[PDB]
Amino acid sequence: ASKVKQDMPPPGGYGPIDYKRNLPRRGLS
Amino acid sequence: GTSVKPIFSRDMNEAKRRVRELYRAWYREVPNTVHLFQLDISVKQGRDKVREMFMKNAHVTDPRVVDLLVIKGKMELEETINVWKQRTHIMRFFHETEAPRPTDFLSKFYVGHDP
Amino acid sequence: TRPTIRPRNDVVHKQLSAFGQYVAEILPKYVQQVQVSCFNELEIFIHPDGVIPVLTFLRDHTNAQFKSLADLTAVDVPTRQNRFEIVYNLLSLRFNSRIRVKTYTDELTPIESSVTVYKAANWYEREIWDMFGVFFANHPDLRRILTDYGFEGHPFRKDFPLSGYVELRYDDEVKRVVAEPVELAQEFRKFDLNSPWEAFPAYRQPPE
Amino acid sequence: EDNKQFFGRHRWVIYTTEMNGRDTFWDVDGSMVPPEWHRWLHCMTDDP
Amino acid sequence: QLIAVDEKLDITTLTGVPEEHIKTRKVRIFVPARNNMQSGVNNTKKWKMEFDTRERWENPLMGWSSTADPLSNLVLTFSTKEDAVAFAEKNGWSFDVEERKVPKPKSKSYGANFSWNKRTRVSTK
Amino acid sequence: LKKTTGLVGLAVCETPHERLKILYTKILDVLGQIPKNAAYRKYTEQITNEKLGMVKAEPDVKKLEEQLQGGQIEEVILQAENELSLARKMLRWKPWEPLVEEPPANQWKWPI
Amino acid sequence: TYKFVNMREPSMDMKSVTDRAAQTLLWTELVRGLGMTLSYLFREPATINYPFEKGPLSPRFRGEHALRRYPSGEERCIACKLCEAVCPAQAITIEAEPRADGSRRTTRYDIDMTKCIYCGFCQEACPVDAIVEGPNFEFSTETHEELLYNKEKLLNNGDKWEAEIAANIQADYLYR
Amino acid sequence: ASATRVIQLLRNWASGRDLQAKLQLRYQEISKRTQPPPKLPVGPSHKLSNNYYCTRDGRREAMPPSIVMSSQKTEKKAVTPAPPIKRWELSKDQPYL
Amino acid sequence: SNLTLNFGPQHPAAHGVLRLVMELSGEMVRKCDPHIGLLHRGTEKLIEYKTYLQALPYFDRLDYVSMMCNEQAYSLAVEKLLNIQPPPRAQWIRVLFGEITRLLNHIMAVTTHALDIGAMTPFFWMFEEREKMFEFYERVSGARMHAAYIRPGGVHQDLPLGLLDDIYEFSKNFSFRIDELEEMLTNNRIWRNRTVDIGVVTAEDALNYGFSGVMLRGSGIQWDLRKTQPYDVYDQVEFDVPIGSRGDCYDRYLCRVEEMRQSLRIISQCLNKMPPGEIKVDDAKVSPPKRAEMKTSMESLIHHFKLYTEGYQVPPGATYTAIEAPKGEFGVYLVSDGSSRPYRCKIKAPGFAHLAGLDKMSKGHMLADVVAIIGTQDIVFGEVDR
Amino acid sequence: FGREDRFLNYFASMRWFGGVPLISLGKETVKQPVYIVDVSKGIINAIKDPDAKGKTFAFVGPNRYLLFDLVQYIFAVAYRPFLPYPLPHFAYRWVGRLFEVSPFEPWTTRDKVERVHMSDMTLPHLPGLEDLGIQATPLELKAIEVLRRHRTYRWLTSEMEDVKPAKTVNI
């Protein structure tokens, strides 16, 4: 009478995944 | 009546004049093809091949079929002139690697199971 | 009926039926039939002489404006008098819809080229010429597109054999790639798979 | 093995210098690995 | 704008088929017989066009079945007999046509199994 | 006022109201030469009269675009030109006539 | 919902103008790219030391074919010909007959590895788990005729790779 | 990565970001190559009763296409194939790149 | 007279087997004539001799850069003709692997486009990520690229018990790789002079020439099939459609990079919202039963036999099913006569129309510009030639 | 003679020495060269011929030419300047001895010298290619496929009908 074991996300969810462009300032005047 | 639609020709006279102009074009083009493709055949051989190719379809009496054959011949000539074809495509018209398949009854009886 | 059956949308069904009403009404001269399939796809069967008018209407009318030509293909049905069935699939971005226009022809009757209506057809018709042998009148450049140079025949016809009539190999004597009658080490094995019991009674035909 | 390496370099084999009949000091290939160590080496399992 | 062609339709020159596969081939137009291993009759509805069997030999390597007939796997499906005949005629193939066979209607009766005087009575049930 | 319509090759049309009025009036004029019982004539006059009234009744460009549902009025002008061209082609083609020919007996019968 | 990729304009203040002029005349973005390439140089490469190191694989990996046996040594194949029927590439040739003890067994089982597409449909169709695609992929040959497998070659492949094939099936059969 | 701190600072300055936070190579943060067995739940139609196939037969619900004025067989407001498409919105998340 | 030149097929910049016959006045292109069919294998005629399951691997080989997408399109068409529905978990897996496939395809396209121009390094940088994604493919299916995972009833097998975590670990580091690629290319002035105002096509010309995908969105046309005609759980994910302004190579490059970012977004959402349940339609007359049931149940064995020998019969009818593949609208016109074999299967690939429009797009440009245009059209000849 | 022969290529390669040394100007020697494909077809037909068991065949070409005319035609096909000079037998034998010394394939040898300057025999009592169903191919139809490789760029596209075949001393 075992329970269902299946590939699922963990309780709650996964951590945030960064996707926006990130090009730092990295410059002088 | 049969209620049929033309492609280019109304009767066999227009089809025949189209055939004649295509033959003129091929006859003119053969020497240039021989020089460009560096063929080992003669110009007379190539013109005989052109004549034989034209004569294979001498039995057609439908102007529509004749028009379609002329269209296909124009496409072949365009491929040859633009050098889209290679030497292999030009030389496939002569069948120089195929052994002569016999025609009479006894040879067919001697070689294989089929007529 | 819920989990494993595809849901039905009747709003789109009614909309497509009404537009078929509209198209068949505007063009009685060419439209021969209008159909809507149960998965919400609209088909219009027209006389061949109306390839250029109907398409132009579907491209240029304000209520239609099907401004994209998704595909243009042919189907071979050897049992029909008109052997080849020509299919146009059009997409309307303004109304987010798709339409299908089908006509017919045989081996000797040409069809007006729709390159003027749709510039995308230029290659498509060439493929139909290459694969099926359907000639298109008034084409800017009609020639073979997919087969080899000097290839005889139109392979997509049902009577054309699967493996063709010739095969290529390199010959060392003539020092070139040559073509010879096809021979196979192992013949393609034909399987008779059709079951002797019908599956779908809804498509049963009259008992002849 | 060396678990401090990144995935791909964490397991490896040094081949023998003499297989069935030939000298394999310089001539080595991946077909010399027996099936059990083959399963271990290609990370199909975590157990040798 | 019509031209009113007269003679029989012939597209043999436009098909790319070698001559030996037109003048020497014989096609059969028929309705396939029911497979007696089964009772279903769904495969006896359409007409079929097939070609005559050619030579098959065995490969020197691996002993597979080699062929040289390009039309050995070609079967065409038609609605009526005259459609197939027209297709064969316009493609330049000689044909043999076998007329359709149907099982004649039979008079069945369950009561005949228990006849009072006829031979129809069954020994066992 | 507006800059960069956003579609490449479609320039901003300054003062589109009178351009749309001209286009719709030309479409109506060319439809006047089509037989009255033709479905194309009645349908196209209906929709173009609706559009012309909408154009006349709104001076603002943004509100006119919202009501017309035609997608960024420069495209509405393009569609008006397309409709005028189609009307001329329809006048030459005359497809309100009855069906030119019926198909063969079993041309559209599927399967087989 | 949509966004614009290239629909921005630069500022016109003299500070931004001088910044752009310095970028043009001193090549700052080229130096940034040079910097990026330089960063990679000090990083550890992703190269593995093949053949002494091997790429990661999975139990589901399908490579060279093999015919298996029962623990007693009897061949699992019962000549049902489902693998031949399902084969997309028609790469399986099977001939069968009754054995000396009446067992249903094959006399010919050939797989053309130059015809095969390694889709694994044959091991899904098999009802007795006789034909499998093993873990091996390093079986390149020097002649075309060496890639035409017969029943002896496939049985030898099974006998050679059974230890690992059984372990892979043990870790996978609960997903099938 | 086993790189020294000086080299790490050099790479971080050259690229302008922090590299050790996100490393291309997978070291030990990955899943185990040996996993426990699954259970794989069954589908909805695994009932013992009230499960006749005729009530869940998708293929037999297909019909031949409906015929809308076959040719062989009142103002009438005009229609479009579908309602006009609604205009798109400009990405409250990030409208400009 | 102009000089006639053969570009390909044995050319690094020909992207495979393409014979571009060009007439040149100097290095200025006067006409491009694309000769194709050097990879024409007769896929459609071959499909006409297979069952619906047997014909599935052909679609993997059609666009060998985006495989699960072709599988999904064919499966959607066959499902529509069968009047069946995939389970929700199957649909979520399909969308997840479609987005992974989109990432693979965009990496391939951008890196080889830059390779043609002369930027050789981002190719190496991003093919490591491509290798990790092939590891995902192999783990779920057993093949690195030709998975045959997506079936016309769902998917073949369930995800292994550690795949989602590994996909998550991959997904939280890919934005940095995109950022490094953008640092190399986006603001480089050489890249801009190579790509800006090259191959500009107007929106109306793009519509009439049959373009789709980025080729449309580079011109500013707001069209995306996943947003306008959703075909899966795509109507439950949130993302933005990148839209260009100038219709040139640079705008399309920016659009593809932003589509990679949005694919990362969709992948995150799919990882969060994966539901439980079965993976294929619970109808054994379409999808095979589980091997245990096949080995213990009579009906399961009969259905396994008949599915793997003959296959399911599809009701007669014709459909045109299209999806938003990474290269554009990928479609199939499928005609079924009621048997277990397709009667006709026409495959519509965006590359066909794009390559037909290459000659229009190359007007008034140089040889290097034509190389850039070929790169930016994102052409793979497996689908153009079929 | 053929593409890989040491008969046409041998004579064509002597252009590298400026002049062509011919013993007695090549006027005392008669040659009857045969095509390679003819020889191969004859061997095949002899394999398949049931009555060719203990027979001896002589495969010869259809035309006989003097060595001078043959070499002149060879140089005319390759469009190379023909500058022949007579060399005494002893001196040209000495040249062959000098060339024999090489540890590789010799350019010429004394035996090659003797075989080149010797007339082809006439054997009218032996069967030939016609007895095997083979019609001999004359040199004039297959010389271009061998000697086009020995042309410069300017003459590389000249046709076969441009050489005016040489004189044949037949009967």
Ligand SMILES: C=C(C)[C@H]1Cc2c(ccc3c2O[C@@H]2COc4cc(OC)c(OC)cc4[C@@H]2C3=O)O1
């Ligand atoms: C040179 C290194 C960095 C890489 C790049 C590369 C190879 C080997 C081969 C090729 C290649 O790139 C070129 C250009 O891009 C594609 C794209 C293709 O598919 C889209 C494709 O399929 C045939 C072929 C190609 C070329 C193909 O010759 O190694």
Ligand code: SF4
């Ligand atoms: S893997 Fe696929 S192609 Fe290869 S033998 Fe098995 S079923 Fe046939």
Ligand code: SF4
């Ligand atoms: S390998 Fe399996 S499927 Fe193939 S014949 Fe043997 S038992 Fe049947």
